[PDB]
RNA sequence: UUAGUAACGGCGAGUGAAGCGGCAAAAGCUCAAAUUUGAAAUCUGGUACCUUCGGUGCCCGAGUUGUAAUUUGGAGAGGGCAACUUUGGGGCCGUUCCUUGUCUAUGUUCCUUGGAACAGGACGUCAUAGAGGGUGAGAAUCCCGUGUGGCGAGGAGUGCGGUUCUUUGUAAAGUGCCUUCGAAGAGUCGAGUUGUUUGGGAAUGCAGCUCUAAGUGGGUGGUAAAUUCCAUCUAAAGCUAAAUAUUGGCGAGAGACCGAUAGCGAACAAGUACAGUGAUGGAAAGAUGAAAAGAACUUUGAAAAGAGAGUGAAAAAGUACGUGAAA
RNA sequence: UAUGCCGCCCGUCUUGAAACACGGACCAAGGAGUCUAACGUCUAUGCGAGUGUUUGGGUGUAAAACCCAUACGCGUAAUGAAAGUGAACGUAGGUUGGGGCCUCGCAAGAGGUGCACAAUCGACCGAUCCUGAUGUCUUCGGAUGGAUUUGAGUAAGAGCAUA
RNA sequence: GAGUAGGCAGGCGUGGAGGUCAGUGACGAAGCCUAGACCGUAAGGUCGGGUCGAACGGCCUCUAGUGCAGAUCUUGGUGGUA
């Protein structure tokens, strides 16, 4: 919408909002990140600390598919079971009707232990787990099956 | 439900009667119909330029 | 329009009419037939050829009639006999009439016109 | 020429990009061209599907191996199993991949029954006998869908031993990290001195 | 069948007809009902006298 | 999509891929290295005849310093035994794809202003046709077309259907078990070095120069080497539609674009007139009216023209022509 | 138009312009903060632990509209150079505030419960520095508990898409 | 209740776009001229008279090649000097 732009509200006023002393010139500091160590040091060190210099070791041909391992907390673990069959498990599953949560089909590598799960055997199938994840699943009365 | 009365081809009510199919009880927001229509109308357009 | 190969473009249609060659200006300069001639043949309108007799239906020259002299294709007009303007000097000049404002009161019948009439579906010659 | 306080952006427009901007107005125009192109190919290939029977194949890269997917072509092993020729398969509408080899029984058996189910459902016309008019089923790949094999049940019993699956993974990682160093500390101090000793 | 009723879910994928902010679009009915007319305090002439 | 990421970089400015994943389209193959060796089986050419994008007979030539049949790594070849199973050619229309032709409804009814009715009011008509343009002002119904179907003629024909002569064939293809084999590309691969290039970093590709392999062999496995395994391909020879590009050429549809200082430099006899030795530079310039009805004829003046007369709906439209602003 | 009084020529750079500083003879028309990729804030809209149909398919009265699968981007977890590890002692903590609501009351008020947010003391996750249990491929494992250390963290999710 | 540079808000005007007023119009659209009128603090709007001859407007929204006195601005035309 050109008609809302202040350009339309600027017609008449000599300098078009850019002042009579600054004049609005082409590039009165350079062209993008120019003088970051020179005359834009204060803005770089503030707001962008750590920009300049190297840190850590390089990795040639780093395939992001090796480091997949997306995470599921236990507060969100029970949300994996469909709501059609959920409540039948959450009210008296109890050993031999202990539900089977395959977290890899759900698309998670690791399970982490943030949440409090209800006291139910909840046989979990995960590639990786935390120490506190497998603690809380055994405590609730289930198990972690590695795959 | 007002229970709408059906008309024949030659005007003529005194036919069957249907209920409202439930979309008519929905909110009418001229502000959302405005903004959505505005952008939907721009979809059937052709480009212009001064050649090069 | 449903057929995509035809154009509804005013620019194209204007040029296609004005730069139409002689053979297609034949068909553009068509005239409707009289109530009597349409009852006879059973055909709406034909392309005006040279020596057909017609009646004027519109314009200042409305009501006048006679044989057509010149099918002036190049001017998109047909000049009719007896329908002329006498200049100030006293020399006559034929008035340019469009054939769609005329009506074919009498047909000029040759083998190619009998063929044209039978083709459209006329119940005679 | 530096911000108030804004993220440092990397806008790659220091070449003559304006000379090779490609705007896709042709999207709708190409879409009807592709549909016409499909309709005319189905008129040419009159009673036969547009696509060939693809095999099932488990995706590579451990991120994606959790799901199966329609591969390129069956195999010389699966074709011989199903009971036809790699030549005859290509002609009667089966993709055959000379490259791929079978190291997996569940994938092999899945694809072998997939060839048997395709052979069951098609009715191959004779060369010069008679043409029986069978209205064309367009998408073979839609007729034979890729079923992601469900490898478990709803609910089970806790067949527990209590080995701490975290401690299992942590020991398995240690066995990996010290496999070679322990073979070296077994080649010296354990052996190469016992080899001389009585 | 298309937009969905209360009984019929819908023909579109997991679509619900949008819900109402306001129960009754008629504001007068609520303002004049009973319980609001009980709680509120008597009004003041509709134009303050020029004192 | 990965991703403005891994990587590069006076590690500053800045640059910067690839794999997997979803989808578009899909289709595969060919030589060299083999003893046809109980038969150069192969090919150009010339000549004659025919049914002529070619065919056949005969004759010269090419060629054994290797032209055909067979084999291409997924294989496969030779030898052995055992049972089947499948095949080619053209002619003739229909239908197919292009090139076109033709036909296929409806008011010119009444009144009113006007030069003209295509305008207003009344009464209709057709409509799978109220796209568009023309006609003396805004026309579905005046004309051309538009819509819907029809009937033609002329090409490219192998997609198929019907369809009739054959007849390949005694010759070719796939398939099973055994047995011996199983050729697979060199100034190349690779290495050093120089230059260049890449995101490719003790070197990503390319190139010059020196060296120059091997046959369980060679390449690759994104930190140089040595020792040990593993995985994965099979280089140095070659053919191959579609999905992709398309400010050119030809043919068509379009537009919330421009509307004669705008839009292409060019709406006009525009790359024209014209400048410069040359390369090259490169304009301005659309509108009378429905119709020339472009002003008969008279009078002043040598004449151009003037004042009349007239044409025109208007000359406050006179070819210095719609409107005709301001300086 | 006359008369009383007032009134330097505008635009610009400038501490300062009537300036002996610059542009302007006059007029018509043209004539200068645009579009885009990627983003910060704020706001509207949708849906909301999700979100985003439109690369693509289906469909169509045909560049429109309508419908749609699998992914993918971002968010739902952080911290380390990295191999890695990964968020409840408690009513998801205590303390001082805190709108609003509940109780007793005429009211003044007192008492209770206290969201957001604010300060503060803690607890939890990763890192760094130690501590170094049961054990054991005897050098692996790292329980357990600390540290004026540290993080763009957790502590009943706010985001995604569009304008 | 001042105000440069500057910010923000409310409007005025232009080319187009969707919708609507069954809007105006050859008995005269638009354009231009007007020491005539009325409205608006204003940007501007409305009307009468003339010339003219074919289109144009109000309102709710969309969009922008949208408003000129200056640029020794561009093109074209015109002057005073004369």
UniProtKB/Swiss-Prot annotation, chain A:
InterPro entries: Ribosomal_uL15 (IPR030878), Ribosomal_uL15/eL18 (IPR021131), Ribosomal_uL15/eL18_sf (IPR036227), Ribosomal_uL15_CS (IPR001196). It is found in: Cytoplasm. Its main location: cytoplasm. A motif (Nuclear localization signal) lies at residues 6-12, 23-29. One of its GO terms (cellular component) is cytosol. GO terms for biological process: cytoplasmic translation. Pfam families: Ribosomal_L27A (PF00828). GO terms for molecular function: RNA binding; structural constituent of ribosome. There is a cross-link at residue 95 (Glycyl lysine isopeptide (Lys-Gly) (interchain with G-Cter in ubiquitin)). Residues 1-38 are annotated as: Disordered. The keyword Signal does not apply. Keywords: Cytoplasm, Isopeptide bond, Ribonucleoprotein, Ribosomal protein, Ubl conjugation. Gene3D superfamilies: 3.100.10.10. Residues 1-13, 20-29 have a biased composition (Basic residues). PROSITE patterns: RIBOSOMAL_L15. Changing residue 37 to E: Confers resistance to cycloheximide, an inhibitor of polypeptide elongation. Component of the ribosome, a large ribonucleoprotein complex responsible for the synthesis of proteins in the cell. The small ribosomal subunit (SSU) binds messenger RNAs (mRNAs) and translates the encoded message by selecting cognate aminoacyl-transfer RNA (tRNA) molecules. The large subunit (LSU) contains the ribosomal catalytic site termed the peptidyl transferase center (PTC), which catalyzes the formation of peptide bonds, thereby polymerizing the amino acids delivered by tRNAs into a polypeptide chain. Belongs to the universal ribosomal protein uL15 family. PANTHER family: 60S RIBOSOMAL PROTEIN L27A, LARGE RIBOSOMAL SUBUNIT PROTEIN UL15. This is Large ribosomal subunit protein uL15. It comes from Saccharomyces cerevisiae (strain ATCC 204508 / S288c) (Baker's yeast).
Swiss-Prot record, chain B:
It comes from the Eukaryota. It is found in: Cytoplasm; Nucleus. N-terminally acetylated by acetyltransferase NatA. Transmembrane segments: none annotated. Belongs to the universal ribosomal protein uL4 family. Component of the large ribosomal subunit (LSU). Mature yeast ribosomes consist of a small (40S) and a large (60S) subunit. The 40S small subunit contains 1 molecule of ribosomal RNA (18S rRNA) and 33 different proteins (encoded by 57 genes). The large 60S subunit contains 3 rRNA molecules (25S, 5.8S and 5S rRNA) and 46 different proteins (encoded by 81 genes). uL4 is associated with the polypeptide exit tunnel. uL4 interacts with its chaperone ACL4 and the nuclear import receptor KAP104. There are 2 genes for uL4 in yeast. The eukaryote-specific C-terminal extension harbors a nuclear import signal and delivers the ACL4-uL4/RPL4 complex to the pre-ribosome, triggering uL4 release from ACL4 and incorporation into the 60S ribosomal subunit. This is Large ribosomal subunit protein uL4A. It comes from Saccharomyces cerevisiae (strain ATCC 204508 / S288c).
From Swiss-Prot, chain C:
Pfam families: KOW (PF00467), Ribosomal_L26 (PF16906). Signal peptide: none annotated. SUPFAM superfamilies: Translation proteins SH3-like domain (SSF50104). The keyword Cytoplasm applies. One of its GO terms (molecular function) is RNA binding. InterPro entries: KOW, Rib_uL2_dom2, Ribosomal_uL24_CS, Ribosomal_uL24_euk/arc, Ribosomal_uL24_KOW, Translation_prot_SH3-like_sf. One of its GO terms (biological process) is cytoplasmic translation. Its main location: cytoplasm. Keywords: Cytoplasm, Ribonucleoprotein, Ribosomal protein. GO terms for cellular component: cytosol; cytosolic large ribosomal subunit. It is found in: Cytoplasm. Component of the large ribosomal subunit (LSU). Mature yeast ribosomes consist of a small (40S) and a large (60S) subunit. The 40S small subunit contains 1 molecule of ribosomal RNA (18S rRNA) and 33 different proteins (encoded by 57 genes). The large 60S subunit contains 3 rRNA molecules (25S, 5.8S and 5S rRNA) and 46 different proteins (encoded by 81 genes). Component of the ribosome, a large ribonucleoprotein complex responsible for the synthesis of proteins in the cell. The small ribosomal subunit (SSU) binds messenger RNAs (mRNAs) and translates the encoded message by selecting cognate aminoacyl-transfer RNA (tRNA) molecules. The large subunit (LSU) contains the ribosomal catalytic site termed the peptidyl transferase center (PTC), which catalyzes the formation of peptide bonds, thereby polymerizing the amino acids delivered by tRNAs into a polypeptide chain. The gene is RPL26A.
Curated annotation (Swiss-Prot), chain D:
GO terms for cellular component: cytosol; cytosolic large ribosomal subunit. Component of the ribosome, a large ribonucleoprotein complex responsible for the synthesis of proteins in the cell. The small ribosomal subunit (SSU) binds messenger RNAs (mRNAs) and translates the encoded message by selecting cognate aminoacyl-transfer RNA (tRNA) molecules. The large subunit (LSU) contains the ribosomal catalytic site termed the peptidyl transferase center (PTC), which catalyzes the formation of peptide bonds, thereby polymerizing the amino acids delivered by tRNAs into a polypeptide chain. The modification Phosphothreonine is found at residues 143, 151. It holds the Pfam family Ribosomal_L13e. One of its GO terms (biological process) is cytoplasmic translation. Component of the large ribosomal subunit (LSU). Mature yeast ribosomes consist of a small (40S) and a large (60S) subunit. The 40S small subunit contains 1 molecule of ribosomal RNA (18S rRNA) and 33 different proteins (encoded by 57 genes). The large 60S subunit contains 3 rRNA molecules (25S, 5.8S and 5S rRNA) and 46 different proteins (encoded by 81 genes). Keywords: Cytoplasm, Phosphoprotein, Ribonucleoprotein, Ribosomal protein. The keyword Ribosomal protein applies. It comes from the Eukaryota. One of its GO terms (molecular function) is RNA binding. The keyword Cytoplasm applies. This is Large ribosomal subunit protein eL13A. Present with 133000 molecules/cell in log phase SD medium. There are 2 genes for eL13 in yeast.
